[PDB]
Amino acid sequence: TGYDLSNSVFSPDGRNFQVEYAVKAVENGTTSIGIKCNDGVVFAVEKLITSKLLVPQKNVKIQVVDRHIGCVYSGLIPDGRHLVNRGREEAASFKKLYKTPIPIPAFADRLGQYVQAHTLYNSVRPFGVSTIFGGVDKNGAHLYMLEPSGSYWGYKGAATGKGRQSAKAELEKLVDHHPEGLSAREAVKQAAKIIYLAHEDNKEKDFELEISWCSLSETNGLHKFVKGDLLQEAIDFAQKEIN
């Protein structure tokens, strides 16, 4: 054997074990989700409060690309930042040449090709993050989830991290109970609930909730963080549902 010692090496199965090993690092990370809604998308993430010494609201994990795309990830946090830095370069060069802001499907492939490129050589390591991202463009709302292999698809709902199965189950119920669609303000509240429900798989340390959203009506198509009254309203809704 020894097929798992080097990146870009095919095993006799036809698998790249190094990428599958990177997935384990993603599974180890905190929970993050994405919910597609009527005219936009909502992102949320679990922030483990390791200590009292952590300053609240001041270790932001959700990142913005351009002015209309939001990105969140689980796994090796630095790797995620590297990917977003590239995403921002890609989105900047697209706008530079084509004038219009980069469409979400276009942006999704830019990250996809870049992550896939890190499975082609033994001189680089695969990315240790699954990235949930999306936004609003000329064709409406789009939600995506990107994995270490470079694989990505469009999603109605997406989840990754240590509490992915709990979150997926909760996401599947929303898709069934709301065939016509979920509103942006509703999706924020639901996102809070699902992070709280997914926290059961990481319940030693208590956590800090962080939500962001893009919506054609509510945020005017731009990415914004949910803060203050709207955040506390969503936290209370989540607190009521666990009890």
DSSP, res 29: S
Alpha-carbon Rg for the chain, nearest whole angstrom, is 18
Report, in Å, the least distance between residue 160 CB and other proteins: 12
Compare residues 36 and 185 and give the one whose CB is closer to other proteins: 36
Q: Is 98 in the site for other proteins (CB under 8 A)?
A: no
Write down the least CB distance from residue 145 to other proteins, Å: 9
Note whether 77 binds other proteins by CB under 8 A: yes
For residue 118, state whether it binds other proteins (rule: CB under 8 A).
Answer: yes
Distance of CA 175 to the CA centre of its chain: 18
- C-beta separation of 68 from 140 below 8 A: no
Tell me if 55 contacts other proteins by CB under 8 A: yes
The CB density around residue 109, as the number of other CB atoms within 10 Å, is 16
Minimum distance of other proteins from residue 152's CB (angstroms): 8
Cβ atoms of residues 70 and 43 within 8 Å:
yes
CB 36 within 8 A of CB 134: yes
What is the token pair recorded at 24?
Answer: 């384990």
Q: Binding residues for other proteins, how many (CB under 8 A)? A: 69
Cβ-in-10-Å burial (0-12, 13-18, 19+) of 164 comes to buried
Cα–Cα distances in Å, from 223 out to 28, 43, 49, 66?
A: 28, 10, 25, 9
Q: Measure the CA dihedral 189/217/33/61, to 10°.
A: -100
- Determine which helix (DSSP H) or strand (DSSP E) holds 3, and give its type and residue range: none
What are the two backbone dihedrals, phi and then psi, of residue 112, each rounded to the nearest 5 degrees?
A: -55, -50
Taking contact as CB under 8 A, which single stretch among the options 38-46, 106-114, 212-220, 230-238 is the one that binds other proteins? 106-114
Pull the structure tokens for residue 61: 């994990």
- Report the site for other proteins in 176-235 (rule: CB under 8 A): none
Q: Which residue in the set 30, 38, 149, 202 belongs to the binding site for other proteins (CB under 8 A)?
A: 149
Q: 């270790």: which residue's tokens?
A: 59
Residue of 1, 30, 100, 160 with catalytic role: 30
Of 39, 48, 154, 233, the one binding other proteins (CB under 8 A) is 154
Give yes or no: 30 in active site.
yes
- Nearer residue to other proteins within complex by CB, 82 or 95: 82
Point out which span in 66-74, 88-96, 171-179, 221-229 binds other proteins (CB under 8 A): 171-179
Among 88, 156, 178, 224, binds other proteins (CB under 8 A): 156
* 28 contributes a contact to other proteins by CB under 8 A: yes
Residues contributing to the site for other proteins (CB under 8 A): 2-15, 18, 21-28, 36, 51-55, 58-59, 76-79, 81-82, 85, 105, 109, 112-113, 115-116, 118-126, 128, 143, 149-158, 168, 171-172, 175
Residues serving a catalytic function are 30
